Amino acid sequence: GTYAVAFRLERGLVFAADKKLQLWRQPGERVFVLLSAGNLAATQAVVSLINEHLSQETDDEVTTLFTAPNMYRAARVVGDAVREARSITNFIFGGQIKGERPRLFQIYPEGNFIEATDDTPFFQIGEHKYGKPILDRVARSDMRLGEAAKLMLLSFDPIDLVIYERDTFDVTREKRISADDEYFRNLSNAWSDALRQAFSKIEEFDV
Amino acid sequence: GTYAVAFRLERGLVFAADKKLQLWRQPGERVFVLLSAGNLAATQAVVSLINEHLSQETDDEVTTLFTAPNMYRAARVVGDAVREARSITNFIFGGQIKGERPRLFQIYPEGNFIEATDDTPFFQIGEHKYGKPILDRVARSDMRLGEAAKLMLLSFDPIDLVIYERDTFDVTREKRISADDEYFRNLSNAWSDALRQAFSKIEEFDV
Ligand code: NA
Numbered sequence: 001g002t003y004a005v006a007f008r009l010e011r012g013l014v015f016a017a018d019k020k021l022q023l024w025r026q027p028g029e030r031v032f033v034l035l036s037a038g039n040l041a042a043t044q045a046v047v048s049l050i051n052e053h054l055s056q057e058t059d060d061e062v063t064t065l066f067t068a069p070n071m072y073r074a075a076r077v078v079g080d081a082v083r084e085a086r087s088i089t090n091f092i093f094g095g096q097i098k099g100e101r102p103r104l105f106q107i108y109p110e111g112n113f114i115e116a117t118d119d120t121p122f123f124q125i126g127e128h129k130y131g132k133p134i135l136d137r138v139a140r141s142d143m144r145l146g147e148a149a150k151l152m153l154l155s156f157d158p159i160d161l162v163i164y165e166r167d168t169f170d171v172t173r174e175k176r177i178s179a180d181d182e183y184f185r186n187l188s189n190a191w192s193d194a195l196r197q198a199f200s201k202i203e204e205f206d207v
Numbered sequence: 208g209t210y211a212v213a214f215r216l217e218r219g220l221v222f223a224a225d226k227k228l229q230l231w232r233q234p235g236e237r238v239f240v241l242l243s244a245g246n247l248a249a250t251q252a253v254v255s256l257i258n259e260h261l262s263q264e265t266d267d268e269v270t271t272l273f274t275a276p277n278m279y280r281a282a283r284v285v286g287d288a289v290r291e292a293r294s295i296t297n298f299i300f301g302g303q304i305k306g307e308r309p310r311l312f313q314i315y316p317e318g319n320f321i322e323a324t325d326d327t328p329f330f331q332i333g334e335h336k337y338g339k340p341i342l343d344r345v346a347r348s349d350m351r352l353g354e355a356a357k358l359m360l361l362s363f364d365p366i367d368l369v370i371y372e373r374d375t376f377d378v379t380r381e382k383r384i385s386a387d388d389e390y391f392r393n394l395s396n397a398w399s400d401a402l403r404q405a406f407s408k409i410e411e412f413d414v
Pocket residue numbers: 140142
């Protein structure tokens with residue numbers, strides 16, 4: 001049982017999962033992040049299929065993550081791996097390729113996918129989609145990368161956190177957040193206090 | 208797929224479910240509410256077993272809802288019906304019997320149960336336990352019955368709502384809340400606005 005979440009914003013992408021977060025990169029050219037909610041076998045099978053084609057593909061017509069000209073094509077690669085791993089839950093796949101905006105996708109068991117938009121700028125995967133009502137109401141596509149990360153982190157209620165900045169083509173802001181992290185506890189405590197105050201205000205309204 | 212929730216407070220009990228809410232009453236003596244999250248067959252089987260003993264029991268030693276001297280005994284009756292309906296998800300059962308405080312229970316598939324306390328004053332049932340993180344942070348046992356109802360209603364994000372006032376032994380405050388209810392939409396809109404403001408405040412805090 002795992003939970004993972006990702007946000008597409010104007011300033012880039014943010015990924016979080018409580019391994020369940022996988023990274024591919026060609027410096028200055030392309031970056032990809034895959035989040036998994038499935039069991040260990042399912043995750044390893046999909047990753048191994050992706051890496052098999054990166055490491056051993058003889059046919060140059062077969063698209064890999066490193067030959068895909070755009071993120072829609074890169075998403076199809078992952079979808080093929082997801083569909084093909086069934087012969088042995090959803091995934092989240094995002095990133096950026098040079099000459100195109102950062103893009104984010106949710107991939108279903110059969111390899112079909114939907115893309116994140118400004119209207120629906122985030123995806124959740126896992127058995128329980130923790131804090132979906134809060135994310136629906138508060139998440140906005142013009143948020144700073146740090147804001148979005150804080151909002152995502154509050155929905156985890158272990159945590160590997162990646163912030164990807166637009167047009168950098170590298171993942172440097174990588175972070176493991178523990179349950180013993182005092183910063184994360186102060187944020188969570190403040191959120192509880194803010195929720196109680198928010199409810200106290202809206203108590204004004206009837207039925 | 209159903210969701211139901213109930214709160215035990217100083218001033219009484221509140222029940223809500225999106226039939227999935229069942230009522231028994233002897234005026235001035237005892238009141239009982241059962242919430243179901245299961246399919247229609249499972250709910251009807253448990254209710255029919257309860258009613259069978261109320262309507263046809265020949266053995267006076269067999270405890271029914273109307274002979275139970277206290278709510279712990281009443282909970283065991285429901286637990287017996289829940290366990291026995293397996294030979295054809297959790298339930299929530301609460302109420303009050305004369306001479307005792309209002310009490311609230313969560314009943315598991317095998318008929319065993321746990322009781323609500325001031326520390327843990329609510330239960331949720333259903334496939335997805337919507338808004339559990341909000342309820343955990345905001346719910347308090349000293350809330351007014353209307354406050355608790357508003358908090359519960361916001362977690363539904365169809366809705367049959369019962370408020371039971373302590374020592375009355377009747378259910379008069381009964382209400383069906385629609386998705387087209389303009390009061391409920393104003394409360395939900397205000398909650399969204401309050402959540403965004405609450406998040407804006409706590410953005411101050413780092414990682
Ligand atoms: Na805005």
